[PDB]
Design a binder for this molecule. Sequence first.
Ligand SMILES: Cc1cc2nc3c(=O)[nH]c(=O)nc-3n(C[C@H](O)[C@H](O)[C@H](O)COP(=O)(O)OP(=O)(O)OC[C@H]3O[C@@H](n4cnc5c(N)ncnc54)[C@H](O)[C@@H]3O)c2cc1C
Length: 498
Amino acid sequence: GYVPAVVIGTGYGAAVSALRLGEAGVQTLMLEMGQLWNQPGPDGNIFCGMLNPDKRSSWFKNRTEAPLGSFLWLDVVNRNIDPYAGVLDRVNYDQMSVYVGRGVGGGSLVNGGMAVEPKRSYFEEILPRVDSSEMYDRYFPRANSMLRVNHIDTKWFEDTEWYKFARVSREQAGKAGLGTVFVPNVYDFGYMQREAAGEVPKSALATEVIYGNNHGKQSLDKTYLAAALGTGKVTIQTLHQVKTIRQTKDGGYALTVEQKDTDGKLLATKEISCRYLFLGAGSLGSTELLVRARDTGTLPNLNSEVGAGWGPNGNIMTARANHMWNPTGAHQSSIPALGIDAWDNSDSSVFAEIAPMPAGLETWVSLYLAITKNPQRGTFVYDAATDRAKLNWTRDQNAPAVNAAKALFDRINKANGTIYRYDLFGTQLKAFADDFCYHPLGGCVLGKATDDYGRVAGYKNLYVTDGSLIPGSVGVNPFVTITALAERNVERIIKQDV
Ligand SMILES: Cc1cc2nc3c(=O)[nH]c(=O)nc-3n(C[C@H](O)[C@H](O)[C@H](O)COP(=O)(O)OP(=O)(O)OC[C@H]3O[C@@H](n4cnc5c(N)ncnc54)[C@H](O)[C@@H]3O)c2cc1C
C-alpha cells in the first residue's frame, strides 16, 4: 500500500532521514532487505564471531571466508554453510569486491565503529558547492552526539595487553617521523574496559566485529533507528527488497518490493506507493536502483551522471613483518583505536588504520587499512540481460592508491629495517590488497546526479541520502560524513519540500 514517505534501506543515510521525518510528523516506512538482528542463534548469541563463523556471517554464500588479512590463520575455521540472509555481503564485481552490511542498521552492524570527521580543507575540496560552515558548526556536532561517539581512555589504552598491537605500530611509525592519532568510536570504551576486567560479556575482546558485535557497539539500531521508532511515525519491514521504482500516473512513486524468508525463498511481491521517496540503499544499492530505473524506462528523466563517479575511498590493505622483539600480542581488541595520519590533501596523502588481527596467537604481523587520494573513478553500467548494475572498475585504476600506500609504508620499513608480508592475500606474492572496498563512495554524486541536498535531478520528491552522494573519497572512515550530510539534507528537504 500507500505510505506518505518510504525510505529504502536502514543504514546511515536512511536512519537519519527516517528520524527527522518522524519527528516532523511524516508517517514513514523503511524497507530493509536484510534481517532485524535480535534473535539468539544456536550458540545463544545474535552474531557469530570471527573464530566461529557460520551462516550468520554471510549474505547468501555457500562457504564462510576469513577476514581480509587473516586467511593464513583463520581458513582453518572456515566451513560450508547454507545460503542464508547473513550479515556481511561480499559483492563481487569483475575487478573489485565491495563489502557491505545487510540488516536493520546496514553497515553499522559490521563496521569497526570508527567515527572520524574529515579534514575541513579536504571537505571543501571535494564538495565546493556545500556550505562548509554549516557542516562544521551544526551538522558534524549533531551527528557526533546522535551516533554516541566516545573516546578511549588514554591510560587504559597505554596499559592494556589488548592494544599492544597498536602501540607497536605507533613506535615503528615514530621512528620514521610519522604520527598517530586516537580514533573516536561508537563502541563503548567504558564497556570495553569492563570486558578486559572480566566484568561483562566480551565482544570486542572476543574476536567479534565484522559479523556483528554481540555487546558494546552502538550500531544504528540502538541510536538513530531506535529514536526513529520512538517517534511513533516510523515502521520497519525487514526481508523486503525494493526491485523497481516508477513515477505513478497520479503523482508520487510506486515500488515493486520482494518479501523473502531467511533462506531466500520468495514469499510475496508487493506494490508500495508514496509521496516522498528516500533512497538509503548505499553506494551500491541506491545507484543500482536508479541505473535500473533509467535504463529500463521507469524513471526515464534521470541524467547521465546517475551511475558515475564511484571510488573505493582509496582503500588499500597492507602488512609489515615485525622484528621478533616486537610481538603484537595474541590478544588484540577487534576495534581499532589508533591511526597514522599522513594526510595533507596532496596526492601522497595516507590516513591508515592500525588494524587488529584476530588469530589469537602471536604472528608478529602489523596490518593496516590505508585511505588514499586516487582520482580514478568507476561507473555502474546497467546490464539489462542479468538486470544488474555492473561496476566497470579495473584493478589498474588502484595503482595510484597502491603507490601512495607503498610510499608511506616504505618509509616505515626503511626506518625500522623491516619488510612487508607478501603472503596474506593469496599465494601470489602480493603485499597490497588492491581489489577490495569497505568504504564504497559515489554513484549518485551530490550536485551531479542530484542537487546539493540529494534531490534527484529530473524528479520532484525523490531523494538520495547515503554514500552514493559522496564523490569517491573523504580521506577518513566515511560514516560520520554520511551521517552529517544526511542531517543537512533532510533538514533542508523537510523545510522546503515537505
Ligand atoms: C568491514 C567494514 C568495516 C568498516 N569500518 C568502518 C569504520 O570503522 N568507520 C566508518 O566510518 N566506516 C566503516 N565502514 C564503512 C561504513 O560502514 C559505510 O560507509 C556505511 O555503512 C555506508 O552507509 P550507507 O547509509 O551509505 O549504506 P549502508 O550502511 O551500506 O546501508 C544500506 C542498507 O540498505 C539495504 N539495502 C540495499 N539495497 C536495498 C534494497 N534494494 N531494498 C532494501 N534494502 C536495501 C542494505 O541491506 C543495508 O542495510 C566499514 C564497512 C565495512 C563493510
